[PDB]
Coordinates of C-alpha atoms and ligand atoms in Angstrom, one line a residue:
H22 CA 0.9 -16.2 59.3
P23 CA -2.3 -16.9 61.1
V24 CA -3.1 -20.4 62.6
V25 CA -6.0 -22.8 62.9
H26 CA -6.1 -23.7 66.6
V27 CA -8.2 -26.8 67.4
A28 CA -8.9 -28.0 70.9
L29 CA -9.7 -31.6 71.6
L30 CA -11.3 -33.2 74.7
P31 CA -11.6 -37.0 74.7
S32 CA -13.4 -39.1 77.3
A33 CA -12.3 -42.3 79.1
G34 CA -11.4 -45.5 77.3
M35 CA -9.2 -46.4 74.4
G36 CA -12.3 -46.6 72.3
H37 CA -12.4 -42.8 72.7
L38 CA -8.8 -41.8 73.0
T39 CA -7.6 -43.8 70.0
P40 CA -10.0 -42.2 67.4
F41 CA -9.4 -38.7 68.9
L42 CA -5.6 -39.0 68.6
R43 CA -5.9 -40.3 65.1
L44 CA -8.1 -37.3 64.4
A45 CA -5.4 -35.1 66.0
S46 CA -2.8 -36.5 63.7
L47 CA -5.0 -35.7 60.7
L48 CA -5.3 -32.1 61.8
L49 CA -1.6 -31.8 62.6
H50 CA -0.8 -33.0 59.1
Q51 CA -3.2 -30.2 58.0
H52 CA -1.0 -27.6 59.8
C53 CA -3.3 -27.1 62.8
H54 CA -2.0 -26.1 66.3
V55 CA -3.6 -28.8 68.4
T56 CA -4.5 -28.3 72.1
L57 CA -5.3 -31.6 73.8
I58 CA -7.1 -31.7 77.2
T59 CA -6.6 -34.9 79.2
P60 CA -8.5 -35.4 82.5
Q61 CA -6.5 -37.1 85.2
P62 CA -6.1 -39.7 86.4
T63 CA -6.5 -41.8 83.2
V64 CA -8.5 -44.9 83.8
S65 CA -6.3 -47.4 81.9
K66 CA -2.6 -47.8 81.5
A67 CA -3.0 -48.0 77.7
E68 CA -4.5 -44.5 77.8
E69 CA -1.4 -43.5 79.8
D70 CA 1.0 -45.2 77.4
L71 CA -0.7 -44.0 74.2
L72 CA -0.7 -40.3 75.3
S73 CA 3.0 -40.4 76.3
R74 CA 3.9 -41.9 72.9
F75 CA 1.6 -39.4 71.0
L76 CA 3.0 -36.3 72.7
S77 CA 6.5 -37.8 72.3
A78 CA 5.8 -38.0 68.5
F79 CA 4.0 -34.6 68.3
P80 CA 5.8 -32.4 70.9
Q81 CA 4.1 -29.3 69.3
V82 CA 0.7 -30.3 70.9
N83 CA -0.3 -27.9 73.6
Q84 CA -1.2 -30.4 76.3
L85 CA -3.4 -29.3 79.3
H86 CA -4.1 -31.3 82.4
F87 CA -6.6 -31.0 85.3
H88 CA -7.6 -33.3 88.1
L89 CA -10.9 -34.9 89.2
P90 CA -12.4 -35.5 92.6
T91 CA -20.8 -49.5 88.5
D92 CA -18.1 -49.5 85.7
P93 CA -14.8 -47.7 86.1
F94 CA -15.0 -46.2 82.6
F95 CA -18.7 -45.3 83.0
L96 CA -17.8 -43.6 86.3
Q97 CA -15.0 -41.4 84.9
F98 CA -17.6 -40.4 82.2
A99 CA -19.4 -38.7 85.1
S100 CA -16.3 -37.3 86.9
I101 CA -15.4 -35.5 83.7
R102 CA -19.1 -34.6 82.9
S103 CA -20.4 -33.7 86.4
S104 CA -17.3 -32.4 88.3
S105 CA -15.4 -30.3 85.8
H106 CA -17.5 -27.6 84.5
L107 CA -14.3 -25.9 85.6
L108 CA -12.9 -26.7 82.2
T109 CA -13.6 -23.1 81.0
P110 CA -10.4 -21.5 82.3
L111 CA -8.4 -24.0 80.2
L112 CA -10.4 -23.3 77.0
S113 CA -11.1 -19.6 77.4
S114 CA -7.4 -18.6 77.9
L115 CA -5.9 -20.5 74.9
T116 CA -3.2 -18.8 72.8
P117 CA -2.9 -18.6 69.8
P118 CA -6.6 -17.6 69.3
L119 CA -8.8 -20.7 69.2
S120 CA -10.4 -21.6 65.9
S121 CA -12.6 -24.6 66.8
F122 CA -13.4 -27.1 69.5
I123 CA -14.1 -30.9 69.2
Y124 CA -15.2 -32.8 72.3
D125 CA -16.4 -36.3 73.1
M126 CA -20.0 -37.3 72.3
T127 CA -20.4 -38.3 75.9
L128 CA -19.9 -34.7 77.2
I129 CA -22.4 -32.8 75.1
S130 CA -24.6 -31.3 77.9
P131 CA -21.9 -29.7 80.1
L132 CA -19.5 -28.8 77.3
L133 CA -22.1 -27.2 75.0
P134 CA -22.4 -24.0 77.1
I135 CA -18.6 -23.8 77.5
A136 CA -18.2 -24.2 73.7
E137 CA -20.9 -21.6 72.9
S138 CA -19.1 -19.0 75.0
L139 CA -15.8 -19.6 73.3
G140 CA -17.2 -18.0 70.1
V141 CA -15.7 -20.6 67.9
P142 CA -17.4 -23.4 65.8
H143 CA -17.7 -26.4 68.1
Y144 CA -18.4 -30.0 67.1
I145 CA -18.6 -33.5 68.7
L146 CA -16.6 -36.6 67.7
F147 CA -19.0 -39.6 67.7
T148 CA -16.7 -42.6 68.2
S149 CA -19.4 -45.2 67.3
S150 CA -21.2 -45.8 64.0
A151 CA -23.3 -43.3 62.2
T152 CA -26.1 -45.8 62.5
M153 CA -25.6 -45.7 66.2
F154 CA -25.6 -41.9 66.1
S155 CA -28.9 -41.9 64.2
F156 CA -30.2 -44.1 67.0
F157 CA -28.8 -41.6 69.5
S158 CA -30.4 -38.8 67.5
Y159 CA -33.8 -40.6 67.1
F160 CA -33.9 -41.7 70.8
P161 CA -35.9 -38.8 72.3
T162 CA -38.8 -39.4 69.9
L163 CA -39.3 -43.1 70.7
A164 CA -38.8 -42.5 74.4
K165 CA -41.4 -39.7 74.3
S166 CA -44.1 -42.3 73.9
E167 CA -46.0 -43.8 76.8
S168 CA -45.2 -47.2 75.2
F169 CA -41.6 -46.7 76.0
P170 CA -39.9 -48.8 77.2
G171 CA -42.1 -51.8 77.7
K172 CA -43.7 -51.7 74.3
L173 CA -41.0 -51.2 71.7
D174 CA -40.2 -54.4 69.7
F175 CA -38.5 -52.6 66.7
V176 CA -36.8 -49.2 66.3
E177 CA -37.3 -48.1 62.7
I178 CA -35.4 -45.0 61.5
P179 CA -36.1 -44.0 57.8
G180 CA -33.2 -44.5 55.4
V181 CA -30.4 -45.6 57.8
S182 CA -28.2 -48.6 57.0
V183 CA -30.1 -50.8 59.5
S184 CA -33.8 -50.1 58.7
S185 CA -35.2 -52.4 61.4
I186 CA -33.4 -52.5 64.8
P187 CA -35.1 -55.1 67.0
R188 CA -35.4 -54.8 70.7
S189 CA -32.7 -57.4 71.0
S190 CA -30.1 -55.0 69.5
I191 CA -31.0 -52.0 71.7
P192 CA -28.5 -51.4 74.5
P193 CA -30.0 -53.0 77.7
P194 CA -29.5 -50.0 80.0
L195 CA -31.7 -47.8 77.7
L196 CA -34.7 -50.1 78.2
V197 CA -34.6 -49.5 82.0
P198 CA -36.1 -46.3 83.3
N199 CA -33.9 -44.0 85.4
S200 CA -30.8 -45.5 83.9
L201 CA -27.6 -43.5 83.7
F202 CA -27.4 -44.1 80.0
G203 CA -31.0 -43.2 79.6
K204 CA -30.4 -39.9 81.5
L205 CA -27.5 -39.0 79.2
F206 CA -29.4 -39.9 75.9
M207 CA -32.4 -37.7 76.9
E208 CA -30.1 -34.9 78.1
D209 CA -27.7 -34.8 75.1
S210 CA -29.6 -35.7 71.9
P211 CA -32.0 -32.6 72.0
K212 CA -28.9 -30.4 72.4
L213 CA -27.5 -31.7 69.1
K214 CA -29.0 -28.8 67.1
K215 CA -26.9 -26.3 69.0
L216 CA -23.7 -28.0 67.6
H217 CA -21.9 -26.8 64.5
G218 CA -21.6 -30.4 63.2
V219 CA -21.0 -34.0 64.0
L220 CA -17.8 -35.9 63.1
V221 CA -18.1 -39.7 62.7
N222 CA -15.3 -42.2 62.1
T223 CA -17.0 -43.8 59.1
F224 CA -17.2 -43.6 55.3
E225 CA -19.7 -44.1 52.5
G226 CA -18.3 -47.6 51.8
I227 CA -19.9 -49.1 54.9
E228 CA -22.7 -46.7 56.0
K229 CA -23.8 -45.0 52.8
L230 CA -27.5 -45.0 53.8
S231 CA -27.1 -43.7 57.4
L232 CA -25.0 -40.7 56.2
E233 CA -27.6 -39.9 53.5
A234 CA -30.5 -40.1 56.0
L235 CA -28.9 -38.0 58.7
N236 CA -27.8 -35.3 56.2
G237 CA -31.2 -35.7 54.5
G238 CA -33.1 -34.8 57.6
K239 CA -35.0 -38.1 57.3
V240 CA -33.9 -39.1 60.9
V241 CA -34.4 -35.8 62.8
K242 CA -35.3 -32.6 61.0
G243 CA -32.7 -29.9 61.7
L244 CA -29.8 -32.1 62.8
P245 CA -26.3 -30.5 62.2
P246 CA -24.3 -31.7 59.3
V247 CA -22.7 -35.2 59.8
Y248 CA -19.2 -35.4 58.4
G249 CA -17.9 -38.9 57.7
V250 CA -14.2 -38.2 58.5
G251 CA -13.4 -42.0 58.5
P252 CA -11.8 -44.3 58.1
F253 CA -9.3 -43.1 60.8
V254 CA -6.0 -44.6 59.7
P255 CA -3.9 -46.1 62.5
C256 CA -0.8 -43.9 63.1
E257 CA 2.7 -44.9 64.0
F258 CA 2.7 -43.6 67.6
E259 CA 0.1 -46.3 68.5
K260 CA 2.7 -49.1 68.4
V261 CA 4.6 -50.0 71.6
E262 CA 8.2 -59.0 69.5
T263 CA 6.9 -62.5 69.9
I264 CA 3.5 -61.8 68.3
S265 CA 5.3 -60.0 65.5
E266 CA 7.4 -63.1 64.7
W267 CA 4.7 -65.8 65.3
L268 CA 2.5 -64.3 62.6
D269 CA 5.3 -64.4 60.1
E270 CA 5.4 -68.2 60.2
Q271 CA 1.6 -68.7 59.5
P272 CA -0.1 -69.0 56.1
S273 CA -1.7 -65.9 54.7
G274 CA -5.4 -65.6 55.7
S275 CA -5.2 -68.5 58.2
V276 CA -5.1 -66.8 61.6
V277 CA -8.3 -65.9 63.4
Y278 CA -7.7 -62.8 65.5
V279 CA -10.0 -62.6 68.5
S280 CA -10.3 -59.5 70.7
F281 CA -13.3 -58.0 72.6
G282 CA -12.0 -54.5 73.0
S283 CA -10.1 -52.6 75.7
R284 CA -12.9 -52.2 78.3
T285 CA -14.7 -55.6 78.3
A286 CA -13.9 -58.9 80.1
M287 CA -15.8 -62.0 79.5
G288 CA -17.2 -64.2 82.2
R289 CA -14.7 -66.8 83.3
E290 CA -16.7 -69.9 82.2
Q291 CA -17.9 -68.1 79.0
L292 CA -14.3 -67.1 78.3
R293 CA -13.2 -70.8 78.6
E294 CA -15.9 -71.7 76.0
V295 CA -14.1 -69.4 73.6
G296 CA -10.8 -71.3 73.8
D297 CA -12.7 -74.5 73.7
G298 CA -14.3 -73.4 70.5
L299 CA -11.0 -72.1 69.1
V300 CA -9.2 -75.5 69.3
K301 CA -12.5 -77.2 68.2
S302 CA -12.2 -75.2 64.9
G303 CA -8.9 -76.5 63.6
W304 CA -7.8 -73.0 62.7
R305 CA -4.8 -71.0 63.8
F306 CA -5.8 -68.2 66.2
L307 CA -4.4 -65.1 68.0
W308 CA -6.6 -64.6 71.0
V309 CA -6.3 -61.5 73.3
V310 CA -7.8 -62.2 76.7
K311 CA -9.0 -59.7 79.3
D312 CA -9.8 -60.9 82.9
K313 CA -10.8 -57.4 84.1
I314 CA -12.3 -54.3 82.6
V315 CA -9.3 -52.1 83.4
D316 CA -5.9 -53.5 82.4
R317 CA -4.3 -52.2 85.7
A318 CA -6.2 -54.6 87.9
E319 CA -5.2 -57.8 86.0
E320 CA -4.7 -60.0 89.1
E321 CA -4.6 -63.7 88.2
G322 CA -2.4 -65.3 85.5
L323 CA -3.4 -66.9 82.3
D324 CA -2.9 -70.4 83.6
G325 CA -5.5 -69.8 86.3
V326 CA -7.9 -67.8 84.1
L327 CA -8.1 -70.4 81.3
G328 CA -8.0 -73.4 83.5
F329 CA -5.8 -76.5 83.5
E330 CA -8.1 -78.4 81.1
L331 CA -8.0 -75.8 78.3
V332 CA -4.3 -74.9 78.9
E333 CA -3.4 -78.6 78.3
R334 CA -5.2 -78.4 74.9
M335 CA -3.7 -75.1 73.9
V336 CA 0.0 -76.0 74.2
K337 CA -0.7 -79.4 72.6
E338 CA -1.2 -77.7 69.2
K339 CA 1.1 -74.7 68.9
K340 CA -1.5 -73.8 66.2
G341 CA -2.6 -70.7 68.1
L342 CA -1.2 -68.0 70.4
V343 CA -3.0 -66.6 73.5
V344 CA -1.9 -63.4 75.2
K345 CA -3.2 -61.4 78.1
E346 CA -1.6 -58.1 77.3
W347 CA -2.2 -54.9 75.3
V348 CA -1.3 -55.6 71.6
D349 CA -1.0 -53.5 68.5
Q350 CA -4.3 -54.6 67.1
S351 CA -3.8 -52.6 63.9
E352 CA -0.4 -54.3 63.5
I353 CA -2.2 -57.6 63.8
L354 CA -5.0 -56.9 61.4
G355 CA -2.6 -55.5 58.8
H356 CA -0.6 -58.7 58.8
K357 CA -1.3 -60.8 55.8
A358 CA -1.4 -64.0 57.9
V359 CA -4.7 -62.8 59.5
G360 CA -7.9 -63.6 57.6
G361 CA -10.6 -63.7 60.3
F362 CA -11.6 -61.4 63.1
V363 CA -13.8 -62.4 66.0
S364 CA -14.7 -59.0 67.4
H365 CA -17.1 -57.6 70.0
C366 CA -17.8 -55.1 67.2
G367 CA -16.6 -51.9 68.9
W368 CA -16.6 -49.3 66.2
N369 CA -12.9 -48.5 66.3
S370 CA -11.9 -52.1 65.7
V371 CA -14.7 -52.4 63.1
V372 CA -13.5 -49.6 61.0
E373 CA -9.9 -50.9 61.5
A374 CA -11.0 -54.2 60.1
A375 CA -12.7 -52.3 57.3
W376 CA -9.4 -50.5 56.7
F377 CA -7.5 -53.7 56.4
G378 CA -10.2 -55.7 54.6
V379 CA -10.5 -58.4 57.3
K380 CA -13.9 -60.2 57.4
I381 CA -15.5 -60.1 60.8
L382 CA -17.2 -62.7 63.0
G383 CA -19.4 -60.5 65.2
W384 CA -19.9 -61.4 68.9
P385 CA -21.5 -58.3 70.4
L386 CA -21.6 -58.1 74.2
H387 CA -22.8 -54.8 75.5
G388 CA -24.2 -51.4 74.4
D389 CA -24.0 -50.4 70.8
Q390 CA -22.1 -53.5 69.8
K391 CA -25.2 -55.3 68.3
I392 CA -26.1 -52.3 66.1
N393 CA -22.6 -52.1 64.7
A394 CA -22.7 -55.8 64.0
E395 CA -25.7 -55.7 61.6
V396 CA -24.2 -52.6 60.1
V397 CA -21.3 -54.9 59.1
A398 CA -23.8 -57.8 58.2
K399 CA -25.6 -55.5 55.8
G400 CA -22.3 -54.7 54.0
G401 CA -21.8 -58.4 53.2
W402 CA -18.3 -58.7 54.8
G403 CA -19.3 -60.1 58.1
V404 CA -21.5 -62.5 60.0
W405 CA -22.9 -62.5 63.6
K406 CA -25.2 -64.9 65.4
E407 CA -28.3 -63.1 66.6
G408 CA -29.3 -65.8 69.1
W409 CA -26.1 -65.5 71.1
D410 CA -27.5 -62.4 72.9
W411 CA -25.6 -60.1 75.2
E412 CA -22.8 -61.0 77.6
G413 CA -24.0 -62.7 80.7
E414 CA -27.4 -63.6 79.4
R415 CA -26.2 -66.8 77.7
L416 CA -23.4 -69.3 77.7
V417 CA -22.3 -69.8 74.1
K418 CA -20.9 -73.3 74.0
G419 CA -17.6 -74.2 72.3
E420 CA -19.4 -76.2 69.6
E421 CA -21.3 -73.2 68.3
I422 CA -18.2 -71.0 68.5
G423 CA -16.2 -73.6 66.5
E424 CA -18.8 -73.8 63.9
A425 CA -19.2 -70.0 63.6
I426 CA -15.5 -69.7 63.1
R427 CA -15.2 -72.4 60.5
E428 CA -18.2 -70.8 58.8
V429 CA -16.5 -67.4 58.4
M430 CA -13.0 -68.6 57.5
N431 CA -13.9 -70.6 54.4
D432 CA -16.5 -68.2 53.2
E433 CA -14.9 -66.4 50.3
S434 CA -18.1 -64.4 49.7
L435 CA -17.1 -62.2 52.7
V436 CA -13.5 -61.8 51.5
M437 CA -14.8 -60.7 48.1
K438 CA -16.8 -58.1 49.9
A439 CA -14.2 -57.4 52.6
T440 CA -11.7 -56.1 50.1
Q441 CA -14.3 -54.1 48.4
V442 CA -14.8 -52.3 51.7
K443 CA -11.0 -51.9 51.8
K444 CA -11.0 -50.4 48.4
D445 CA -13.7 -47.9 49.3
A446 CA -11.8 -47.1 52.5
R447 CA -8.8 -46.0 50.5
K448 CA -10.9 -43.9 48.1
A449 CA -12.4 -42.1 51.1
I450 CA -9.0 -40.7 52.1
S451 CA -7.7 -39.9 48.5
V452 CA -8.5 -36.7 46.6
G453 CA -12.2 -36.3 46.3
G454 CA -13.2 -38.8 48.9
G455 CA -15.7 -38.2 51.7
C456 CA -13.1 -37.5 54.4
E457 CA -10.8 -35.1 52.5
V458 CA -13.8 -33.2 51.2
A459 CA -15.2 -32.8 54.7
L460 CA -11.9 -31.9 56.2
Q461 CA -11.2 -29.1 53.7
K462 CA -14.7 -27.7 54.4
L463 CA -14.1 -27.4 58.2
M464 CA -10.6 -26.1 57.6
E465 CA -11.8 -23.2 55.4
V466 CA -14.5 -22.2 58.0
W467 CA -12.0 -22.1 60.9
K468 CA -10.2 -19.1 59.3
Ligands
UDP528 O1 -5.3 -55.3 72.8 C1 -5.9 -54.3 72.2 C2 -7.2 -54.0 72.4 C3 -7.8 -52.9 71.7 N1 -7.0 -52.1 70.9 C4 -7.6 -51.0 70.2 O2 -8.5 -50.3 71.1 C5 -9.7 -49.9 70.4 C6 -10.9 -50.7 71.0 O3 -12.0 -49.8 71.0 P1 -13.4 -50.3 70.5 O4 -14.4 -49.2 70.3 O5 -13.2 -51.2 69.3 O6 -14.0 -51.2 71.7 P2 -14.1 -50.7 73.2 O7 -12.7 -51.0 73.8 O8 -14.5 -49.2 73.3 O9 -15.1 -51.6 73.8 C7 -9.4 -50.2 68.9 O10 -8.8 -49.0 68.3 C8 -8.4 -51.3 69.0 O11 -7.5 -51.4 67.8 C9 -5.7 -52.4 70.7 O12 -5.0 -51.7 69.9 N2 -5.2 -53.5 71.4
G50_529 O1 -24.9 -47.0 73.4 C1 -23.8 -46.7 73.6 C2 -23.2 -45.4 72.9 C3 -22.3 -44.7 73.9 C4 -22.8 -43.3 74.2 C5 -22.9 -42.9 75.6 C6 -23.4 -41.7 75.9 C7 -23.8 -40.8 74.9 O2 -24.3 -39.6 75.2 C8 -23.8 -41.2 73.6 C9 -23.3 -42.5 73.2 C10 -22.9 -47.6 74.4 C11 -23.4 -48.1 75.6 O3 -24.7 -47.8 75.9 C12 -22.7 -49.0 76.4 C13 -21.4 -49.3 76.0 O4 -20.6 -50.2 76.9 C14 -20.9 -48.8 74.9 C15 -21.6 -48.0 74.1 O5 -21.0 -47.5 72.9

């Protein structure tokens, strides 16, 4: 019996490894021989731990390694992109015969020629939102102007979920000429037409308009088909028990879970304004803290990071729990005791909240996080304060944070729309949904 051999190449960061491994699980449950390529060394320890648990759960995955010669994650983005065009010997000698190839969206330019020489249908996995991909697709046109970048107050793509993207929501690095992110956007987006398709962890329940505009040509004429293979359901290998038991003693829909991702640390005095606003809200909270970008370099303890003033106020309540570790976020969002999510609006944690029907308080910080926020705000199951701006540009006080939390928690209008998203997320994976329809199409082509 023949085989459908799928090779996967993720990039640095849990925001990229987690959706790739969930995609790998979906393919493995579709009887695909999966080859997973991991560049070494991995940036974070969570990437190290997740891979060791994934390959312990799926030992039939053909794992291939290779070594490599600003931000630590944005640097490994280059050491994979720039250094190792010597990825061809790993891909061109795969047995059983390769059937397809899916690589990270941040590696389009160097991997596109490698993929074209493999003679198999090749795709990208866009870990962010389809609305963000439409921005990535439409970027070469608005940068082509002489008005770029100084004169561009609004980005307007026809038919996407966010019709009017103000300058405030554009990633700051893109507005600066000769930026590393500007170099990548101009180098990759024109090469999108060479691809056989784009896979996005999203579904019609949240980005109905963006998927219809991309596949309708109304964004860029000739774009490859965009397959909404979301929502990526969290698998069992992702879990690594105080937090497990503390949530069992809290009322349902009363804990506000706060996490700003895996690769973002707040400023020390802005971080202390969060805990100030948490206790000022009178609500139970589960706050995940990061003092550094990479979890390996966590130097100082929580008593020194939060300060003696806020530490005195935290333990006086026992109403909330603060940790500075890697937690099973999908295990927290799935708990019935959680009703609110203060999130940096990274697309993985956004779709996860959509999967568990948890309303979101959006606090975007860098990059695409502001676009993903208004994508949620359009859906009616989340709020985000536009004047709070990016991380570092402003000091959001604890009084505003406390208000913004109390605003979201007692707003049942969001919950009524948060469960509707949860209902559509289940229909997306059932028979006839957008994901199962798209997966069976790609499966039949790879034979
Ligand atoms: O303590 C943590 C922090 C993050 N995550 C997971 O890591 C991903 C975060 O990626 P996202 O794109 O949301 O933000 P990024 O980390 O890329 O900024 C999501 O799948 C979260 O569920 C987790 O499981 N535990
Ligand atoms: O805007 C994006 C999209 C990421 C991206 C990078 C390269 C590429 O070719 C396509 C998409 C972005 C940033 O700018 C900065 C971030 O911290 C995160 C983030 O998601």
